[PDB]
Amino acid sequence: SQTVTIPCHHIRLGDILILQGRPCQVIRISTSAATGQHRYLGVDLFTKQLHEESSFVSNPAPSVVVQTMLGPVFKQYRVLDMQDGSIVAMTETGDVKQNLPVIDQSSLWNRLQKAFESGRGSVRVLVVSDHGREMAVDMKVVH
Protein backbone atom coordinates (compact mmCIF):
# COMPACT_ATOMS: atom_id res chain seq x y z
CA SER A 1 0.00 0.00 0.00
CA GLN A 2 3.11 2.14 0.42
CA THR A 3 5.25 0.77 -2.48
CA VAL A 4 5.14 -0.29 -6.14
CA THR A 5 7.39 -2.83 -7.86
CA ILE A 6 9.39 -1.43 -10.80
CA PRO A 7 11.40 -3.52 -13.30
CA CYS A 8 15.01 -2.46 -13.36
CA HIS A 9 15.00 -1.90 -17.10
CA HIS A 10 12.45 0.92 -16.49
CA ILE A 11 14.64 2.72 -13.88
CA ARG A 12 16.64 5.78 -14.99
CA LEU A 13 18.82 8.37 -13.31
CA GLY A 14 16.65 10.79 -11.35
CA ASP A 15 13.89 8.27 -10.57
CA ILE A 16 12.74 7.96 -6.94
CA LEU A 17 13.21 4.52 -5.38
CA ILE A 18 12.98 3.11 -1.85
CA LEU A 19 16.59 2.42 -0.83
CA GLN A 20 17.26 0.86 2.58
CA GLY A 21 13.65 1.79 3.43
CA ARG A 22 14.12 5.51 2.54
CA PRO A 23 12.75 7.44 -0.47
CA CYS A 24 15.78 8.47 -2.52
CA GLN A 25 16.58 10.13 -5.84
CA VAL A 26 18.81 7.79 -7.92
CA ILE A 27 22.14 9.36 -8.90
CA ARG A 28 24.17 6.35 -10.02
CA ILE A 29 23.31 2.94 -11.51
CA SER A 30 25.91 0.18 -11.78
CA THR A 31 26.04 -3.61 -12.18
CA SER A 32 27.55 -6.10 -9.74
CA ALA A 33 30.27 -8.18 -11.39
CA ALA A 34 29.53 -11.18 -9.14
CA THR A 35 25.73 -11.36 -9.19
CA GLY A 36 24.50 -9.26 -12.12
CA GLN A 37 22.27 -7.36 -9.69
CA HIS A 38 21.93 -3.65 -10.35
CA ARG A 39 23.14 -1.29 -7.62
CA TYR A 40 21.36 2.03 -7.04
CA LEU A 41 23.03 4.95 -5.26
CA GLY A 42 20.53 7.59 -4.16
CA VAL A 43 20.05 10.74 -2.11
CA ASP A 44 17.53 10.53 0.76
CA LEU A 45 14.76 13.05 -0.02
CA PHE A 46 14.39 13.96 3.67
CA THR A 47 17.88 13.74 5.25
CA LYS A 48 19.99 14.21 2.06
CA GLN A 49 22.27 11.33 3.10
CA LEU A 50 23.48 8.80 0.51
CA HIS A 51 22.10 5.24 0.50
CA GLU A 52 22.72 2.28 -1.78
CA GLU A 53 20.67 -0.85 -2.40
CA SER A 54 20.90 -3.68 -4.96
CA SER A 55 18.03 -5.15 -6.95
CA PHE A 56 15.96 -8.23 -6.12
CA VAL A 57 16.27 -11.04 -8.70
CA SER A 58 13.35 -13.45 -9.01
CA ASN A 59 12.43 -16.41 -11.23
CA PRO A 60 8.60 -16.47 -11.03
CA ALA A 61 7.92 -18.65 -14.10
CA PRO A 62 9.94 -20.88 -16.46
CA SER A 63 12.50 -18.81 -18.38
CA VAL A 64 11.20 -15.62 -16.69
CA VAL A 65 13.91 -13.79 -14.72
CA VAL A 66 12.81 -10.48 -13.17
CA GLN A 67 14.94 -7.77 -11.53
CA THR A 68 12.97 -5.14 -9.61
CA MET A 69 13.22 -2.35 -7.05
CA LEU A 70 10.51 -0.69 -4.96
CA GLY A 71 9.29 2.83 -5.68
CA PRO A 72 7.00 4.85 -3.41
CA VAL A 73 3.29 5.25 -4.04
CA PHE A 74 2.88 8.97 -4.72
CA LYS A 75 -0.20 10.70 -3.37
CA GLN A 76 -1.65 13.71 -5.19
CA TYR A 77 -3.03 16.62 -3.11
CA ARG A 78 -4.75 19.86 -4.12
CA VAL A 79 -2.96 23.08 -3.12
CA LEU A 80 -5.09 25.52 -1.07
CA ASP A 81 -2.47 28.09 -0.03
CA MET A 82 1.27 28.72 -0.09
CA GLN A 83 2.98 30.14 3.03
CA ASP A 84 6.78 30.52 3.49
CA GLY A 85 8.27 27.33 2.07
CA SER A 86 5.28 25.16 3.06
CA ILE A 87 1.78 24.75 1.64
CA VAL A 88 -1.73 24.04 2.83
CA ALA A 89 -2.80 20.93 0.94
CA MET A 90 -5.99 18.89 0.71
CA THR A 91 -6.42 15.16 0.16
CA GLU A 92 -8.88 13.62 -2.26
CA THR A 93 -11.33 13.18 0.63
CA GLY A 94 -11.05 16.77 1.91
CA ASP A 95 -8.55 16.14 4.75
CA VAL A 96 -6.51 19.37 5.20
CA LYS A 97 -2.72 19.33 5.77
CA GLN A 98 -1.77 22.77 7.09
CA ASN A 99 2.06 22.82 6.94
CA LEU A 100 3.14 20.44 4.22
CA PRO A 101 6.83 21.00 3.36
CA VAL A 102 8.05 21.31 -0.24
CA ILE A 103 11.37 19.67 -1.21
CA ASP A 104 14.09 22.09 -2.35
CA GLN A 105 14.79 20.23 -5.59
CA SER A 106 14.74 21.30 -9.26
CA SER A 107 13.13 24.70 -8.49
CA LEU A 108 9.94 23.00 -7.33
CA TRP A 109 8.81 25.88 -5.12
CA ASN A 110 9.14 28.47 -7.90
CA ARG A 111 7.40 26.28 -10.47
CA LEU A 112 4.65 25.57 -7.92
CA GLN A 113 4.14 29.26 -7.16
CA LYS A 114 3.90 30.20 -10.86
CA ALA A 115 1.36 27.44 -11.55
CA PHE A 116 -0.65 28.18 -8.38
CA GLU A 117 -1.01 31.88 -9.28
CA SER A 118 -2.27 31.10 -12.83
CA GLY A 119 -4.93 28.50 -11.92
CA ARG A 120 -5.22 27.32 -8.31
CA GLY A 121 -7.79 24.56 -8.84
CA SER A 122 -5.79 22.59 -11.42
CA VAL A 123 -2.44 22.48 -9.51
CA ARG A 124 -1.56 19.22 -7.70
CA VAL A 125 1.47 18.26 -5.61
CA LEU A 126 2.85 14.73 -5.67
CA VAL A 127 3.61 13.68 -2.15
CA VAL A 128 5.86 11.03 -0.62
CA SER A 129 5.62 9.72 2.92
CA ASP A 130 8.54 8.57 5.08
CA HIS A 131 7.33 7.00 8.35
CA GLY A 132 4.53 9.47 9.02
CA ARG A 133 6.45 12.41 7.53
CA GLU A 134 4.95 13.80 4.30
CA MET A 135 6.62 16.02 1.74
CA ALA A 136 5.71 17.48 -1.67
CA VAL A 137 8.36 16.33 -4.16
CA ASP A 138 6.85 17.26 -7.54
CA MET A 139 3.82 18.94 -9.12
CA LYS A 140 1.28 18.31 -11.87
CA VAL A 141 -1.43 20.35 -13.60
CA VAL A 142 -4.73 18.54 -14.16
CA HIS A 143 -6.33 18.90 -17.60
Author numbering: 30 to 172
Original paper wording:
Here, we present InCellCryst, an advanced pipeline for producing homogeneous microcrystals directly within living insect cells. We have demonstrated the pipeline on five different proteins (IMPDH, HEX-1, Cathepsin B, Luciferase and EGFP-µNS), representing a selection of soluble proteins of different source organisms that crystallize in insect cells in their native compartment or, in case of peroxisomes, readily in the cytoplasm or nucleus of the cells. Importantly, as shown for IMPDH and HEX-1, InCellCryst can produce crystals from native protein sequences, without purification tags or even remnants of proteolytically removed tags, within a quasi-native cellular environment. The rich source of biomolecules in the cellular environment allows the identification of native ligands by co-crystallization at quasi physiological conditions, representing a unique feature of InCellCryst.
The disruption of the native PTS1 signal by cloning into the pFB1 cyto and cyto v2 vectors transformed the hexagonal crystal blocks into a spindle-like shape. Whereas HEX-1 cyto and cyto v2 both formed spindle-like as well as bipyramidal crystals, HEX-1 ori crystals exhibit a hexagonal block shape. Serial diffraction datasets of the crystals contained in viable cells was performed using a helical grid scan approach, available at the EMBL P14 beamline located at the PETRA III storage ring (DESY, Hamburg, Germany). CrystFEL is optimized for still images in high multiplicity collected at RT at XFEL sources and thus, can be directly applied to serial synchrotron data. All HEX-1 structures show an increased flexibility between Phe145 and Ser151, the C-terminal loop region after the α-helix.
